[PDB]
Ligand binder design. Sequence first.
Ligand code: NA
Ligand code: NA
Lengths: 377, 377
Amino acid sequence: NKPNRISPELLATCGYFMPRIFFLNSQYAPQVHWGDVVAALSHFPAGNLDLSSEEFWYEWMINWSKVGDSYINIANSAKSEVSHVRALRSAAACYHWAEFMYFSDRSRKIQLREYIRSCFLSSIKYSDLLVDHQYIVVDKFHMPFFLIFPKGYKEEENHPLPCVILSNGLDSMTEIEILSLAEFFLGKNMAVAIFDGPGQGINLGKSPIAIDMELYVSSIVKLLEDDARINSNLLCFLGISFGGYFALRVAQRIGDKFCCIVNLSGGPEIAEFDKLPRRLKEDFQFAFMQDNSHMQSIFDEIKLDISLPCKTKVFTVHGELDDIFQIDKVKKLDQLWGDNHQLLCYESEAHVCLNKINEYMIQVSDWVSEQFWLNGY
Amino acid sequence: NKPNRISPELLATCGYFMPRIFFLNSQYAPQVHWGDVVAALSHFPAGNLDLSSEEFWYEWMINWSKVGDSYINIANSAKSEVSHVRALRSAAACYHWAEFMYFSDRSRKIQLREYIRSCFLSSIKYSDLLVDHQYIVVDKFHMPFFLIFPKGYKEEENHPLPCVILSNGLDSMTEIEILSLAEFFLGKNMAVAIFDGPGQGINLGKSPIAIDMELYVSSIVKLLEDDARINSNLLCFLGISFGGYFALRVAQRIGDKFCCIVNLSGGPEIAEFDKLPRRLKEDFQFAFMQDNSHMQSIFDEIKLDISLPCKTKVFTVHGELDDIFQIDKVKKLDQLWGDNHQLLCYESEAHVCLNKINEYMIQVSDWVSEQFWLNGY
Ligand code: NA
Ligand code: NA
């Protein structure tokens, strides 16, 4: 018998995704341990090493689902609330990596996201964080919304807090990657607003993702203006990935509502749809609830008019080797937007610079604090 | 230009150590991100893949030192206390993986452990945990000692707390692996006592490790008896690795002082010294401050008399494929010690079962709580 280990071939093949799967060391956001990846991949079928193939991500979903199931069983037999919550968090992380690049069974993907959201709402019950969970009605759309306050927050012993609104990317889950980012702002005694817009979080596969996501952000701003606990003159919008694209839109359309905006590896336009690597064609197809033939036209419409003015301070983190949002288009935007746009460019980093996420989220969090201080906080 | 990645050959070679390096998702204990491992190993010299070779661990120490240095620079330029502490923790983790299997420069290894301890004492200043740091005098030895209380602890609003004493293994650092384990008990509103006995933590390479570590544990017990904040009738001793060996000694010599004892992959005797794999000969040599020729005699003397009675409830977690503490010797002890010894044996797990550490620390923490409840807590 050999110890349970990940195949060298598989580890190599998954190199791009390993920084995504581990993500950020987080207190509240579900996170995998190395052993969870071993549990998922130790018995992964050999000869299945094509990141672009449907068969790879089927086995990926199946194997990660097993590890999630194992943690739900630990959670169900847990002898304490603290153990129960630890197990539910581990389960949620495993189910997210099961689903995030799986698009072949719409009902199964939605089921896995429901598992994650059920785990999250259970974790909140036993957490030490004040979570204000509600639906924001935008026209006929009921938008899931979480307003989260720093550790030991009491309204009676605090002035109104600054607030960071954070957007999902194409394939993130709100309580996993976005809550992970949000902890950097909670750690600095800021409120955070995380949300499931159309085609985002729990709504992925239910409603098509909205290109004009600023309309939904506008409704969050209106809520924060009405909340006495929040200083609406100290607001930041942060987007990761495609969420970073929304961050550039917010800068153009409603930028004057924000002291500052953070773009984590979003861009003003996406690379040619047909030539997208890995599973990204199916990823974009699933989010927009459209087939291959309709997607380039959507990419055309997505493309920003970069001459339309940037109405606040923007900080972009981008990788030179990003194959989804090309660095040349980001640098063109950086040049045009001038003193209002700061670019941190990582020379040897792929899409979202995930080898640097710990160091750049330190820098980004301190930059946001500075912009609030520059607006007299 | 290719994105910074770890060589397939290197990832494969390091498979045994990757679960050790990532360890446990921790709130206080320093922990690496995936990106830190990439920073360490992306430019690791090719053709250097022998885990048993001195040249491998020299380059390992050099490359991990670079990443630690990078985090100290982030810490020194940090614009907030929260950012400063995040950076110091990341630095401490990197310096630990630089040193933990490096024995060739005594002064450099001690220097790296001093860096970690300086980072830790700085992190305590800005932490939300009550840390009682002092020296326990045992004869002429001044033993570094940390009594840590749960989050939001106030003596005036608490009865005396149960306390878990945790021991280092051969190559752990007290504020890294041991504090990581300790968080499972802090999470359950227990006090934790972590310490640097002879040849342990900051004392590794300064004093030879003491085979009779129970003498130093006895002095901790006396301190906890005198502390009004601690219920001395609700004490647990946990050891990891060689620390688990000390846990078996404590069970034999002063077991009646403890409600329960946890042995994380310690054993009653070590495998033949001469045939030890990887860097373990140099590891044991360094800890005992002795040369190759003296080490088998020490292993002889280390070997327990398993007929000497176990004086409390013991829980052992062990891997079938452990190549340091053979499972057959652990199972012999389990049989002899009877109803007072419980064995969790993982069929396909190597030394310390690190692919299972998250799930088994859930089970272990709940088991300790149960033993305190069985002693009327
Ligand atoms: Na307000
Ligand atoms: Na006491």
